[PDB]
């Protein structure tokens, strides 16, 4: 058996939210359920132990409960500045090992879209001196994320190892992403126009450069 958790929790601030951790018959009920939370880029910390005691270091803000197969972690509202992922842990006698949940990340709930800006960087002469050529284009100043970047040769988009980086959160209230593509100088100089497109879920803009300067 395996322990399942939702991939993310949709929780608006100012109203109560909760998560569920369904397991097996030999995993929940006969043994206590422990909840763990971790900071982004830091160490985890236990939240609720033995389903009715709370550790020293947390105010009277959180609650945890267990009812049969599933255990509930009720949260009294949500702070926008404090959002952490939650874990569910228990024990199974047949597996003879501790089992941990998938991980539930709380997410606040509506802002309008922004205008993305895309740039494309052709390789320099020093890169072509090594009998190689790579092409990279970057997207920034867009909100929200979840963008997909694909290359275009203005006649036929090419698939020679196309990858798409996941978006990352910056500190200036914006996301960023990029796409890389490494080729040979024979294929790079075969086409005199290269561009990449971005998908901002409704808007698409093209950045076309030339392999001259």
């Amino acid at each position: 058996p395996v322990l399942t958790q939702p991939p993310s929790a949709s929780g608006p601030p100012g109203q109560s939210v909760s998560i569920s951790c369904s397991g097996s018959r030999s995993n929940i009920g006969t043994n206590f359920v422990y909840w763990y939370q971790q900071l982004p880029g830091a160490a985890p910390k236990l939240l609720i132990y033995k389903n009715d005691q709370r550790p020293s270091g947390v105010p009277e803000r959180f609650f945890g409960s267990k009812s049969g197969t599933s255990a509930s972690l009720a949260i009294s509202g949500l702070r926008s500045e404090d959002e952490v992922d939650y874990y569910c842990a228990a024990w199974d006698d047949s597996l003879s090992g501790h089992v941990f949940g998938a991980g539930t990340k709380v997410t606040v709930l509506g802002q309008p879209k922004a205008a993305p800006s895309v740039t494309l960087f052709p390789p320099s002469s020093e890169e072509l001196q090594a009998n190689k050529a790579t092409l990279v284009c970057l997207i920034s100043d867009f909100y929200p994320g979840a963008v997909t970047v694909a290359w275009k040769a203005d006649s036929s988009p090419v698939k020679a190892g196309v990858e798409t980086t996941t978006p990352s959160k910056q500190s200036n209230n914006k996301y960023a992403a990029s796409s890389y593509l490494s080729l040979t100088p024979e294929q790079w100089k075969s086409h005199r126009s290269y561009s990449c497109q971005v998908t901002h879920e409704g808007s698409t803009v093209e950045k076309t450069v030339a392999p001259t300067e």
């Binding site: 160490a43 320099s124 090594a130």
Partner: peptide, 30 residues
């Protein structure tokens, strides 16, 4: 029993291609 304290773990990454001195060349702007 409950897990007491977590702090400052180490980074482990299993990878076939590993460390190597870079030979990076400049990239032209737009």
């Amino acid at each position: 029993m409950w897990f007491d304290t977590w702090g400052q773990g180490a980074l482990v990454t299993v990878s076939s291609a590993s460390t190597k001195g870079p030979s990076v060349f400049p990239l032209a702007p737009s």
